[PDB]
RNA sequence: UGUAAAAUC
């Protein structure tokens, strides 16, 4: 802090001194400015703030990447946008040019990415769209998606910019090798998740024109083709299993839920049920499958696999006592008890499938009855016994 | 008996 600067200090003093940049990167100095710029500003105070804070590229970049300064930058941007005077256009154009030119570097900065984010939602839409065009289209875009901070720029784009402007991001991410890298990442998955939700024709998109719905659909199909083509890899992955679960769980993605079940899960239920990550996906599939697929799933567990040649152990034996598989059997049982007890719809496709649920329940009850002694050794076993006991009444 | 995210004074 400059020598000449103690409480009861004026904003004009700071602005006139030429020492703003020193205040803005200081904890106490920036604390002062942040409070001062909330008050009533005259035209000239605003003019000076515009010039010193967002007027020259280097100082703007210096403050934007600063732990304290980035807040002041955001406040002054807000004030610039609220001041519809004659210099309005030149200021917003300049701000767009500054960020545009250092896009990647600002995205990857812990503090500057915050400046990018408030600019995206606050700037006039037409100028915010130009910021989006400045996103990199190479390895650097993956870098942004997998960064714990930068990924939020992409999420903000998805939230507040119309799809046409970021369609290149959808196609970039659907590129097989990009999808593999991004979906194998903790933060990269969050980016794909938010895109999927934006691209879903849910109650949140009813404000779209039909042309915009058509655009949304194409982008959805292109992304989902890539997702379903790598479904096996994604369903079993530590991070991307959550995405597959979301797709299977969401009624508004019903057709993709079915694609996944048919071409990924079916015939692999026994093995997937024994995976740490995929076992959760299998549960979701049971919970949300349409009746016809559900019947195939059940039939696969009860009679899809040949029992062990020596011991006579079947798929259901393995699963009941497996560290992860036991949760799938509990899920199967709970579905059946919910159906038979009315807690779950049994009609679907014009028909009441109650008889099928009773069928599957009887099988499970017969198995649990015969194995009650071994099952009572385990928490899962006791849970199933109790589930069945609570049903009788 | 079994997993992620929710990121700045």
mmCIF file of C-alpha atoms (C1' of nucleotides) in Angstrom:
data_model
loop_
_atom_site.group_PDB
_atom_site.id
_atom_site.type_symbol
_atom_site.label_atom_id
_atom_site.label_comp_id
_atom_site.label_asym_id
_atom_site.label_seq_id
_atom_site.Cartn_x
_atom_site.Cartn_y
_atom_site.Cartn_z
ATOM 1 C CA UNK A 1 0.000 0.000 0.000
ATOM 2 C CA UNK A 2 1.113 3.562 -0.909
ATOM 3 C CA UNK A 3 2.483 5.720 1.908
ATOM 4 C CA UNK A 4 -0.231 8.437 1.640
ATOM 5 C CA UNK A 5 -3.039 5.944 2.289
ATOM 6 C CA UNK A 6 -6.476 4.763 7.375
ATOM 7 C CA UNK A 7 -10.236 4.802 7.973
ATOM 8 C CA UNK A 8 -12.484 7.501 6.462
ATOM 9 C CA UNK A 9 -10.846 7.302 3.039
ATOM 10 C CA UNK A 10 -12.599 8.360 -0.172
ATOM 11 C CA UNK A 11 -12.999 6.449 -3.423
ATOM 12 C CA UNK A 12 -12.088 9.546 -5.425
ATOM 13 C CA UNK A 13 -8.770 9.756 -3.548
ATOM 14 C CA UNK A 14 -7.901 6.244 -4.664
ATOM 15 C CA UNK A 15 -9.051 6.789 -8.234
ATOM 16 C CA UNK A 16 -7.174 10.106 -8.588
ATOM 17 C CA UNK A 17 -3.975 8.833 -6.918
ATOM 18 C CA UNK A 18 -3.146 6.395 -9.710
ATOM 19 C CA UNK A 19 -2.479 3.735 -7.097
ATOM 20 C CA UNK A 20 -5.653 1.712 -7.615
ATOM 21 C CA UNK A 21 -3.772 -1.396 -8.757
ATOM 22 C CA UNK A 22 -1.980 -1.465 -5.391
ATOM 23 C CA UNK A 23 -5.268 -1.354 -3.453
ATOM 24 C CA UNK A 24 -6.956 -3.932 -5.661
ATOM 25 C CA UNK A 25 -4.410 -6.722 -5.011
ATOM 26 C CA UNK A 26 -4.214 -5.952 -1.287
ATOM 27 C CA UNK A 27 -6.668 -7.749 1.030
ATOM 28 C CA UNK A 28 -7.650 -4.637 2.989
ATOM 29 C CA UNK A 29 -7.352 -2.304 0.002
ATOM 30 C CA UNK A 30 -9.639 -4.442 -2.135
ATOM 31 C CA UNK A 31 -12.052 -4.827 0.759
ATOM 32 C CA UNK A 32 -12.363 -1.040 0.767
ATOM 33 C CA UNK A 33 -12.954 -0.713 -2.992
ATOM 34 C CA UNK A 34 -15.530 -3.513 -3.048
ATOM 35 C CA UNK A 35 -17.592 -1.609 -0.478
ATOM 36 C CA UNK A 36 -17.068 1.762 -2.145
ATOM 37 C CA UNK A 37 -18.161 0.622 -5.608
ATOM 38 C CA UNK A 38 -21.493 -0.520 -4.122
ATOM 39 C CA UNK A 39 -22.418 3.071 -3.250
ATOM 40 C CA UNK A 40 -23.604 5.973 -5.379
ATOM 41 C CA UNK A 41 -21.113 6.668 -8.145
ATOM 42 C CA UNK A 42 -20.990 9.875 -10.159
ATOM 43 C CA UNK A 43 -20.324 9.718 -13.883
ATOM 44 C CA UNK A 44 -16.609 10.425 -13.481
ATOM 45 C CA UNK A 45 -16.008 7.914 -10.695
ATOM 46 C CA UNK A 46 -17.568 5.325 -13.000
ATOM 47 C CA UNK A 47 -15.450 6.608 -15.883
ATOM 48 C CA UNK A 48 -12.236 6.174 -13.862
ATOM 49 C CA UNK A 49 -13.177 2.685 -12.659
ATOM 50 C CA UNK A 50 -13.961 1.686 -16.222
ATOM 51 C CA UNK A 51 -10.537 2.959 -17.293
ATOM 52 C CA UNK A 52 -8.410 1.590 -14.456
ATOM 53 C CA UNK A 53 -10.141 -1.739 -13.814
ATOM 54 C CA UNK A 54 -11.392 -2.939 -17.212
ATOM 55 C CA UNK A 55 -9.844 -0.412 -19.584
ATOM 56 C CA UNK A 56 -6.302 -1.683 -20.205
ATOM 57 C CA UNK A 57 -5.574 -5.300 -21.134
ATOM 58 C CA UNK A 58 -2.628 -5.934 -18.808
ATOM 59 C CA UNK A 59 -4.123 -4.466 -15.626
ATOM 60 C CA UNK A 60 -7.432 -6.142 -16.411
ATOM 61 C CA UNK A 61 -5.656 -9.486 -16.777
ATOM 62 C CA UNK A 62 -3.602 -8.792 -13.656
ATOM 63 C CA UNK A 63 -6.686 -8.093 -11.553
ATOM 64 C CA UNK A 64 -8.760 -10.903 -13.091
ATOM 65 C CA UNK A 65 -6.116 -13.504 -12.158
ATOM 66 C CA UNK A 66 -5.735 -12.059 -8.677
ATOM 67 C CA UNK A 67 -7.221 -13.631 -5.539
ATOM 68 C CA UNK A 68 -8.654 -10.305 -4.372
ATOM 69 C CA UNK A 69 -8.782 -8.365 -7.629
ATOM 70 C CA UNK A 70 -11.100 -10.698 -9.517
ATOM 71 C CA UNK A 71 -13.975 -9.551 -7.292
ATOM 72 C CA UNK A 72 -13.416 -5.894 -8.155
ATOM 73 C CA UNK A 73 -13.238 -6.822 -11.828
ATOM 74 C CA UNK A 74 -16.633 -8.506 -11.542
ATOM 75 C CA UNK A 75 -18.223 -5.557 -9.736
ATOM 76 C CA UNK A 76 -16.904 -3.071 -12.285
ATOM 77 C CA UNK A 77 -18.140 -5.238 -15.140
ATOM 78 C CA UNK A 78 -21.546 -5.179 -13.463
ATOM 79 C CA UNK A 79 -21.419 -1.389 -13.160
ATOM 80 C CA UNK A 80 -20.300 -1.034 -16.779
ATOM 81 C CA UNK A 81 -23.281 -3.083 -17.962
ATOM 82 C CA UNK A 82 -25.689 -1.043 -15.830
ATOM 83 C CA UNK A 83 -24.401 2.272 -17.217
ATOM 84 C CA UNK A 84 -26.051 2.811 -20.573
ATOM 85 C CA UNK A 85 -24.099 5.975 -21.429
ATOM 86 C CA UNK A 86 -22.383 6.757 -24.744
ATOM 87 C CA UNK A 87 -19.191 4.803 -23.991
ATOM 88 C CA UNK A 88 -21.176 1.633 -23.231
ATOM 89 C CA UNK A 89 -20.507 -0.134 -26.532
ATOM 90 C CA UNK A 90 -16.763 0.555 -26.616
ATOM 91 C CA UNK A 91 -16.430 -0.770 -23.060
ATOM 92 C CA UNK A 92 -18.295 -4.003 -23.696
ATOM 93 C CA UNK A 93 -16.556 -4.535 -27.031
ATOM 94 C CA UNK A 94 -13.191 -3.989 -25.392
ATOM 95 C CA UNK A 95 -13.982 -6.358 -22.536
ATOM 96 C CA UNK A 96 -15.004 -9.009 -25.080
ATOM 97 C CA UNK A 97 -11.727 -8.495 -26.978
ATOM 98 C CA UNK A 98 -9.608 -8.716 -23.808
ATOM 99 C CA UNK A 99 -11.069 -11.998 -22.592
ATOM 100 C CA UNK A 100 -11.490 -13.401 -26.094
ATOM 101 C CA UNK A 101 -7.743 -13.009 -26.649
ATOM 102 C CA UNK A 102 -6.694 -14.817 -23.464
ATOM 103 C CA UNK A 103 -9.593 -17.248 -23.253
ATOM 104 C CA UNK A 104 -7.841 -20.531 -22.413
ATOM 105 C CA UNK A 105 -5.483 -18.949 -19.904
ATOM 106 C CA UNK A 106 -8.335 -17.219 -18.097
ATOM 107 C CA UNK A 107 -10.456 -20.378 -18.027
ATOM 108 C CA UNK A 108 -7.642 -22.397 -16.431
ATOM 109 C CA UNK A 109 -7.025 -19.699 -13.810
ATOM 110 C CA UNK A 110 -8.756 -20.285 -10.475
ATOM 111 C CA UNK A 111 -9.781 -16.641 -10.230
ATOM 112 C CA UNK A 112 -10.132 -15.493 -13.838
ATOM 113 C CA UNK A 113 -12.552 -18.327 -14.655
ATOM 114 C CA UNK A 114 -14.898 -16.587 -12.220
ATOM 115 C CA UNK A 115 -14.591 -13.368 -14.274
ATOM 116 C CA UNK A 116 -15.375 -15.384 -17.402
ATOM 117 C CA UNK A 117 -18.432 -16.900 -15.730
ATOM 118 C CA UNK A 118 -20.082 -13.649 -14.627
ATOM 119 C CA UNK A 119 -19.333 -12.094 -18.039
ATOM 120 C CA UNK A 120 -21.100 -14.962 -19.795
ATOM 121 C CA UNK A 121 -24.303 -14.522 -17.800
ATOM 122 C CA UNK A 122 -24.307 -10.711 -17.485
ATOM 123 C CA UNK A 123 -23.004 -9.341 -20.807
ATOM 124 C CA UNK A 124 -25.473 -8.736 -23.618
ATOM 125 C CA UNK A 125 -26.152 -12.165 -25.126
ATOM 126 C CA UNK A 126 -24.690 -11.246 -28.526
ATOM 127 C CA UNK A 127 -21.333 -10.320 -26.946
ATOM 128 C CA UNK A 128 -21.377 -13.315 -24.575
ATOM 129 C CA UNK A 129 -21.827 -15.525 -27.668
ATOM 130 C CA UNK A 130 -18.579 -14.100 -29.058
ATOM 131 C CA UNK A 131 -16.762 -15.113 -25.853
ATOM 132 C CA UNK A 132 -17.933 -18.665 -26.473
ATOM 133 C CA UNK A 133 -16.435 -18.651 -29.994
ATOM 134 C CA UNK A 134 -13.049 -17.941 -28.393
ATOM 135 C CA UNK A 135 -13.005 -21.343 -26.654
ATOM 136 C CA UNK A 136 -10.170 -23.599 -27.965
ATOM 137 C CA UNK A 137 -11.065 -26.578 -30.160
ATOM 138 C CA UNK A 138 -8.055 -28.785 -29.433
ATOM 139 C CA UNK A 139 -6.392 -30.613 -26.531
ATOM 140 C CA UNK A 140 -6.830 -27.366 -24.564
ATOM 141 C CA UNK A 141 -10.615 -27.860 -24.473
ATOM 142 C CA UNK A 142 -10.140 -31.222 -22.765
ATOM 143 C CA UNK A 143 -7.777 -29.488 -20.341
ATOM 144 C CA UNK A 144 -10.594 -27.087 -19.488
ATOM 145 C CA UNK A 145 -13.220 -29.812 -19.044
ATOM 146 C CA UNK A 146 -11.029 -31.794 -16.608
ATOM 147 C CA UNK A 147 -9.879 -28.845 -14.508
ATOM 148 C CA UNK A 148 -11.688 -28.502 -11.175
ATOM 149 C CA UNK A 149 -12.162 -24.765 -11.803
ATOM 150 C CA UNK A 150 -12.200 -24.367 -15.590
ATOM 151 C CA UNK A 151 -14.901 -26.984 -16.142
ATOM 152 C CA UNK A 152 -17.380 -24.519 -14.612
ATOM 153 C CA UNK A 153 -16.896 -22.146 -17.549
ATOM 154 C CA UNK A 154 -18.241 -24.863 -19.848
ATOM 155 C CA UNK A 155 -21.122 -25.500 -17.446
ATOM 156 C CA UNK A 156 -21.930 -21.773 -17.437
ATOM 157 C CA UNK A 157 -21.907 -21.684 -21.236
ATOM 158 C CA UNK A 158 -24.367 -24.580 -21.281
ATOM 159 C CA UNK A 159 -26.568 -22.814 -18.744
ATOM 160 C CA UNK A 160 -26.834 -19.345 -20.306
ATOM 161 C CA UNK A 161 -25.933 -19.482 -24.031
ATOM 162 C CA UNK A 162 -28.251 -20.812 -26.781
ATOM 163 C CA UNK A 163 -27.216 -24.219 -28.125
ATOM 164 C CA UNK A 164 -26.314 -23.015 -31.652
ATOM 165 C CA UNK A 165 -23.334 -21.126 -30.210
ATOM 166 C CA UNK A 166 -21.798 -24.113 -28.386
ATOM 167 C CA UNK A 167 -22.806 -26.958 -30.693
ATOM 168 C CA UNK A 168 -19.109 -27.353 -31.473
ATOM 169 C CA UNK A 169 -18.604 -28.370 -27.833
ATOM 170 C CA UNK A 170 -21.164 -31.166 -28.144
ATOM 171 C CA UNK A 171 -19.488 -32.511 -31.295
ATOM 172 C CA UNK A 172 -16.040 -32.137 -29.755
ATOM 173 C CA UNK A 173 -17.090 -34.162 -26.699
ATOM 174 C CA UNK A 174 -18.902 -36.807 -28.769
ATOM 175 C CA UNK A 175 -15.656 -37.470 -30.656
ATOM 176 C CA UNK A 176 -14.869 -41.012 -29.411
ATOM 177 C CA UNK A 177 -11.338 -40.351 -28.113
ATOM 178 C CA UNK A 178 -12.382 -37.082 -26.481
ATOM 179 C CA UNK A 179 -15.394 -38.696 -24.822
ATOM 180 C CA UNK A 180 -13.111 -41.439 -23.455
ATOM 181 C CA UNK A 181 -10.706 -38.906 -21.927
ATOM 182 C CA UNK A 182 -13.367 -36.594 -20.564
ATOM 183 C CA UNK A 183 -15.657 -39.281 -19.174
ATOM 184 C CA UNK A 184 -12.757 -40.998 -17.450
ATOM 185 C CA UNK A 185 -12.319 -37.751 -15.500
ATOM 186 C CA UNK A 186 -13.952 -36.667 -12.259
ATOM 187 C CA UNK A 187 -14.748 -33.133 -13.420
ATOM 188 C CA UNK A 188 -15.031 -34.010 -17.087
ATOM 189 C CA UNK A 189 -18.024 -36.191 -16.188
ATOM 190 C CA UNK A 190 -19.755 -33.215 -14.557
ATOM 191 C CA UNK A 191 -19.438 -31.359 -17.848
ATOM 192 C CA UNK A 192 -20.991 -34.209 -19.821
ATOM 193 C CA UNK A 193 -23.733 -34.623 -17.227
ATOM 194 C CA UNK A 194 -24.772 -30.957 -17.433
ATOM 195 C CA UNK A 195 -24.744 -31.043 -21.243
ATOM 196 C CA UNK A 196 -26.955 -34.146 -21.229
ATOM 197 C CA UNK A 197 -29.514 -32.407 -19.008
ATOM 198 C CA UNK A 198 -29.529 -29.263 -21.129
ATOM 199 C CA UNK A 199 -30.083 -31.446 -24.218
ATOM 200 C CA UNK A 200 -33.052 -33.275 -22.666
ATOM 201 C CA UNK A 201 -36.585 -32.401 -23.760
ATOM 202 C CA UNK A 202 -37.832 -31.952 -20.222
ATOM 203 C CA UNK A 203 -40.232 -29.539 -18.570
ATOM 204 C CA UNK A 204 -37.305 -27.125 -18.391
ATOM 205 C CA UNK A 205 -37.096 -26.789 -22.207
ATOM 206 C CA UNK A 206 -40.758 -26.177 -23.044
ATOM 207 C CA UNK A 207 -39.919 -22.544 -23.765
ATOM 208 C CA UNK A 208 -37.933 -23.578 -26.874
ATOM 209 C CA UNK A 209 -39.189 -22.947 -30.407
ATOM 210 C CA UNK A 210 -39.672 -26.095 -32.488
ATOM 211 C CA UNK A 211 -36.647 -25.185 -34.603
ATOM 212 C CA UNK A 212 -34.657 -24.941 -31.377
ATOM 213 C CA UNK A 213 -36.079 -28.303 -30.235
ATOM 214 C CA UNK A 214 -34.940 -29.792 -33.543
ATOM 215 C CA UNK A 215 -31.436 -28.442 -32.975
ATOM 216 C CA UNK A 216 -31.494 -29.833 -29.418
ATOM 217 C CA UNK A 217 -32.517 -33.268 -30.700
ATOM 218 C CA UNK A 218 -29.711 -33.543 -33.254
ATOM 219 C CA UNK A 219 -27.112 -32.633 -30.652
ATOM 220 C CA UNK A 220 -28.664 -35.130 -28.225
ATOM 221 C CA UNK A 221 -28.571 -37.947 -30.771
ATOM 222 C CA UNK A 222 -24.960 -37.288 -31.733
ATOM 223 C CA UNK A 223 -23.837 -37.278 -28.091
ATOM 224 C CA UNK A 224 -25.922 -40.335 -27.179
ATOM 225 C CA UNK A 225 -24.631 -42.384 -30.081
ATOM 226 C CA UNK A 226 -21.142 -41.858 -28.679
ATOM 227 C CA UNK A 227 -22.236 -42.611 -25.114
ATOM 228 C CA UNK A 228 -24.111 -45.787 -26.010
ATOM 229 C CA UNK A 229 -21.242 -46.988 -28.230
ATOM 230 C CA UNK A 230 -18.928 -46.862 -25.183
ATOM 231 C CA UNK A 231 -21.616 -47.884 -22.714
ATOM 232 C CA UNK A 232 -19.616 -50.848 -21.395
ATOM 233 C CA UNK A 233 -16.598 -48.677 -20.620
ATOM 234 C CA UNK A 234 -18.742 -45.899 -19.093
ATOM 235 C CA UNK A 235 -21.039 -48.113 -16.985
ATOM 236 C CA UNK A 236 -18.050 -49.816 -15.346
ATOM 237 C CA UNK A 237 -16.048 -46.630 -14.801
ATOM 238 C CA UNK A 238 -15.578 -45.039 -11.374
ATOM 239 C CA UNK A 239 -16.905 -41.654 -12.546
ATOM 240 C CA UNK A 240 -19.001 -42.237 -15.655
ATOM 241 C CA UNK A 241 -21.222 -44.877 -14.049
ATOM 242 C CA UNK A 242 -23.184 -41.914 -12.619
ATOM 243 C CA UNK A 243 -23.930 -40.680 -16.137
ATOM 244 C CA UNK A 244 -25.179 -44.075 -17.263
ATOM 245 C CA UNK A 245 -27.323 -44.255 -14.117
ATOM 246 C CA UNK A 246 -28.771 -40.830 -14.881
ATOM 247 C CA UNK A 247 -29.700 -41.870 -18.424
ATOM 248 C CA UNK A 248 -31.350 -45.120 -17.256
ATOM 249 C CA UNK A 249 -33.201 -43.301 -14.434
ATOM 250 C CA UNK A 250 -34.648 -40.480 -16.534
ATOM 251 C CA UNK A 251 -38.064 -41.041 -18.124
ATOM 252 C CA UNK A 252 -37.319 -38.192 -20.531
ATOM 253 C CA UNK A 253 -34.409 -40.241 -21.880
ATOM 254 C CA UNK A 254 -36.520 -43.423 -22.112
ATOM 255 C CA UNK A 255 -35.375 -44.479 -25.596
ATOM 256 C CA UNK A 256 -31.736 -44.244 -24.530
ATOM 257 C CA UNK A 257 -32.440 -46.105 -21.311
ATOM 258 C CA UNK A 258 -33.720 -48.957 -23.500
ATOM 259 C CA UNK A 259 -30.767 -48.845 -25.889
ATOM 260 C CA UNK A 260 -28.413 -49.147 -22.916
ATOM 261 C CA UNK A 261 -30.318 -52.013 -21.341
ATOM 262 C CA UNK A 262 -30.597 -53.990 -24.593
ATOM 263 C CA UNK A 263 -27.144 -53.437 -26.080
ATOM 264 C CA UNK A 264 -25.072 -53.016 -22.936
ATOM 265 C CA UNK A 265 -26.643 -54.615 -19.842
ATOM 266 C CA UNK A 266 -28.592 -57.568 -21.229
ATOM 267 C CA UNK A 267 -26.643 -60.841 -21.112
ATOM 268 C CA UNK A 268 -24.028 -59.199 -18.869
ATOM 269 C CA UNK A 269 -26.134 -58.838 -15.702
ATOM 270 C CA UNK A 270 -24.368 -61.533 -13.687
ATOM 271 C CA UNK A 271 -20.904 -60.102 -14.325
ATOM 272 C CA UNK A 272 -21.913 -56.421 -14.072
ATOM 273 C CA UNK A 273 -23.702 -57.095 -10.774
ATOM 274 C CA UNK A 274 -20.301 -58.167 -9.422
ATOM 275 C CA UNK A 275 -18.588 -54.898 -10.415
ATOM 276 C CA UNK A 276 -18.062 -52.152 -7.857
ATOM 277 C CA UNK A 277 -19.261 -49.430 -10.207
ATOM 278 C CA UNK A 278 -21.567 -51.200 -12.681
ATOM 279 C CA UNK A 279 -23.618 -52.830 -9.905
ATOM 280 C CA UNK A 280 -25.278 -49.450 -9.328
ATOM 281 C CA UNK A 281 -26.158 -49.222 -13.008
ATOM 282 C CA UNK A 282 -27.754 -52.682 -12.880
ATOM 283 C CA UNK A 283 -29.915 -51.606 -9.934
ATOM 284 C CA UNK A 284 -31.148 -48.560 -11.879
ATOM 285 C CA UNK A 285 -31.944 -50.736 -14.877
ATOM 286 C CA UNK A 286 -34.096 -53.033 -12.718
ATOM 287 C CA UNK A 287 -35.842 -50.036 -11.114
ATOM 288 C CA UNK A 288 -36.618 -48.251 -14.369
ATOM 289 C CA UNK A 289 -36.825 -50.870 -17.141
ATOM 290 C CA UNK A 290 -40.115 -51.105 -19.078
ATOM 291 C CA UNK A 291 -42.010 -54.294 -18.199
ATOM 292 C CA UNK A 292 -40.903 -56.293 -21.245
ATOM 293 C CA UNK A 293 -37.212 -55.639 -20.643
ATOM 294 C CA UNK A 294 -37.695 -56.096 -16.907
ATOM 295 C CA UNK A 295 -39.066 -59.572 -17.620
ATOM 296 C CA UNK A 296 -36.006 -60.377 -19.725
ATOM 297 C CA UNK A 297 -33.754 -59.095 -16.931
ATOM 298 C CA UNK A 298 -35.502 -61.242 -14.337
ATOM 299 C CA UNK A 299 -35.516 -64.265 -16.626
ATOM 300 C CA UNK A 300 -31.799 -63.751 -17.175
ATOM 301 C CA UNK A 301 -31.088 -63.893 -13.439
ATOM 302 C CA UNK A 302 -33.427 -66.838 -12.765
ATOM 303 C CA UNK A 303 -32.539 -68.900 -15.862
ATOM 304 C CA UNK A 304 -29.997 -67.108 -18.081
ATOM 305 C CA UNK A 305 -26.879 -68.903 -16.838
ATOM 306 C CA UNK A 306 -25.762 -72.504 -16.531
ATOM 307 C CA UNK A 307 -25.155 -73.593 -12.882
ATOM 308 C CA UNK A 308 -21.666 -74.675 -11.752
ATOM 309 C CA UNK A 309 -21.012 -78.244 -13.028
ATOM 310 C CA UNK A 310 -19.759 -79.532 -9.651
ATOM 311 C CA UNK A 311 -21.499 -77.533 -6.899
ATOM 312 C CA UNK A 312 -24.820 -76.661 -8.531
ATOM 313 C CA UNK A 313 -24.384 -72.957 -7.716
ATOM 314 C CA UNK A 314 -26.466 -70.662 -9.919
ATOM 315 C CA UNK A 315 -26.496 -66.953 -10.771
ATOM 316 C CA UNK A 316 -28.793 -66.154 -7.867
ATOM 317 C CA UNK A 317 -26.594 -68.047 -5.369
ATOM 318 C CA UNK A 318 -23.543 -66.110 -6.542
ATOM 319 C CA UNK A 319 -25.298 -62.760 -6.435
ATOM 320 C CA UNK A 320 -26.976 -63.138 -3.024
ATOM 321 C CA UNK A 321 -23.632 -63.667 -1.329
ATOM 322 C CA UNK A 322 -21.444 -61.405 -3.430
ATOM 323 C CA UNK A 323 -20.074 -58.185 -1.873
ATOM 324 C CA UNK A 324 -21.730 -56.043 -4.569
ATOM 325 C CA UNK A 325 -24.199 -58.503 -6.134
ATOM 326 C CA UNK A 326 -26.191 -58.836 -2.933
ATOM 327 C CA UNK A 327 -27.458 -55.257 -3.447
ATOM 328 C CA UNK A 328 -28.892 -56.168 -6.840
ATOM 329 C CA UNK A 329 -30.856 -59.121 -5.435
ATOM 330 C CA UNK A 330 -32.188 -56.869 -2.657
ATOM 331 C CA UNK A 331 -33.234 -54.451 -5.387
ATOM 332 C CA UNK A 332 -35.035 -57.242 -7.310
ATOM 333 C CA UNK A 333 -36.864 -58.344 -4.185
ATOM 334 C CA UNK A 334 -37.922 -54.813 -3.253
ATOM 335 C CA UNK A 335 -39.343 -54.226 -6.722
ATOM 336 C CA UNK A 336 -41.414 -57.408 -6.487
ATOM 337 C CA UNK A 337 -42.716 -56.668 -2.980
ATOM 338 C CA UNK A 338 -43.570 -53.078 -4.010
ATOM 339 C CA UNK A 339 -45.492 -54.346 -7.044
ATOM 340 C CA UNK A 340 -47.445 -57.030 -5.196
ATOM 341 C CA UNK A 341 -48.255 -54.615 -2.356
ATOM 342 C CA UNK A 342 -49.480 -51.813 -4.621
ATOM 343 C CA UNK A 343 -46.554 -49.469 -3.941
ATOM 344 C CA UNK A 344 -45.646 -49.841 -7.633
ATOM 345 C CA UNK A 345 -47.685 -49.747 -10.854
ATOM 346 C CA UNK A 346 -48.124 -53.191 -12.392
ATOM 347 C CA UNK A 347 -50.010 -52.110 -15.508
ATOM 348 C CA UNK A 348 -48.067 -50.902 -18.544
ATOM 349 C CA UNK A 349 -48.512 -51.338 -22.277
ATOM 350 C CA UNK A 350 -52.257 -51.718 -21.837
ATOM 351 C CA UNK A 351 -51.730 -54.788 -19.658
ATOM 352 C CA UNK A 352 -51.510 -55.578 -15.933
ATOM 353 C CA UNK A 353 -48.271 -57.526 -15.359
ATOM 354 C CA UNK A 354 -49.095 -58.337 -11.724
ATOM 355 C CA UNK A 355 -48.911 -62.048 -12.475
ATOM 356 C CA UNK A 356 -45.265 -61.706 -13.537
ATOM 357 C CA UNK A 357 -44.292 -59.894 -10.353
ATOM 358 C CA UNK A 358 -45.975 -62.644 -8.313
ATOM 359 C CA UNK A 359 -44.062 -65.211 -10.349
ATOM 360 C CA UNK A 360 -40.719 -63.512 -9.628
ATOM 361 C CA UNK A 361 -41.573 -63.024 -5.949
ATOM 362 C CA UNK A 362 -42.426 -66.690 -5.457
ATOM 363 C CA UNK A 363 -39.057 -67.662 -6.932
ATOM 364 C CA UNK A 364 -37.222 -65.265 -4.602
ATOM 365 C CA UNK A 365 -39.276 -66.381 -1.603
ATOM 366 C CA UNK A 366 -38.636 -70.044 -2.316
ATOM 367 C CA UNK A 367 -34.874 -69.356 -2.594
ATOM 368 C CA UNK A 368 -34.745 -67.218 0.566
ATOM 369 C CA UNK A 369 -36.759 -69.841 2.476
ATOM 370 C CA UNK A 370 -34.429 -72.674 1.467
ATOM 371 C CA UNK A 371 -31.259 -70.672 2.227
ATOM 372 C CA UNK A 372 -32.544 -68.834 5.303
ATOM 373 C CA UNK A 373 -29.807 -70.204 7.599
ATOM 374 C CA UNK A 374 -26.856 -69.120 5.463
ATOM 375 C CA UNK A 375 -28.649 -65.862 4.631
ATOM 376 C CA UNK A 376 -29.182 -64.956 8.293
ATOM 377 C CA UNK A 377 -25.373 -64.810 8.785
ATOM 378 C CA UNK A 378 -25.333 -61.633 6.649
ATOM 379 C CA UNK A 379 -26.831 -58.147 6.928
ATOM 380 C CA UNK A 380 -28.148 -58.457 3.350
ATOM 381 C CA UNK A 381 -29.672 -61.843 4.115
ATOM 382 C CA UNK A 382 -31.441 -60.495 7.216
ATOM 383 C CA UNK A 383 -32.671 -57.532 5.176
ATOM 384 C CA UNK A 384 -34.283 -59.820 2.578
ATOM 385 C CA UNK A 385 -35.822 -62.096 5.209
ATOM 386 C CA UNK A 386 -37.286 -59.034 6.917
ATOM 387 C CA UNK A 387 -38.499 -57.589 3.607
ATOM 388 C CA UNK A 388 -40.472 -60.776 2.974
ATOM 389 C CA UNK A 389 -41.714 -60.923 6.565
ATOM 390 C CA UNK A 390 -43.069 -57.365 6.393
ATOM 391 C CA UNK A 391 -44.977 -58.284 3.244
ATOM 392 C CA UNK A 392 -46.971 -61.216 4.675
ATOM 393 C CA UNK A 393 -48.890 -58.652 6.709
ATOM 394 C "C1'" U B 1 -21.790 -55.179 3.748
ATOM 395 C "C1'" G B 2 -20.764 -51.149 -2.015
ATOM 396 C "C1'" U B 3 -18.825 -45.408 -5.754
ATOM 397 C "C1'" A B 4 -18.288 -39.282 -7.911
ATOM 398 C "C1'" A B 5 -19.607 -33.799 -7.940
ATOM 399 C "C1'" A B 6 -21.180 -29.507 -5.203
ATOM 400 C "C1'" A B 7 -14.765 -25.413 -7.412
ATOM 401 C "C1'" U B 8 -12.496 -18.014 -4.950
ATOM 402 C "C1'" C B 9 -11.361 -13.150 0.448
#
